[PDB]
Amino acid sequence: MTADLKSLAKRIYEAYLKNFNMNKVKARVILSGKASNNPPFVIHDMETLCMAEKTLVAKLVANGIQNKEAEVRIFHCCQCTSVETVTELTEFAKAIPGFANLDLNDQVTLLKYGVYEAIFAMLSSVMNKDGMLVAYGNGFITREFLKSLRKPFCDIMEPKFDFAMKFNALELDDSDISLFVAAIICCGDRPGLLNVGHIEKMQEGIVHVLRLHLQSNHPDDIFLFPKLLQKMADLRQLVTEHAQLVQIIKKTESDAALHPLLQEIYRDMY
Ligand SMILES: *c1ccc([N+](=O)[O-])cc1C(=O)Nc1ccccc1
Ligand SMILES: *c1ccc([N+](=O)[O-])cc1C(=O)Nc1ccccc1
Question: At which residues is there a site annotated Essential for heterodimerization with RXRA?
Answer without folding.
Answer: 235
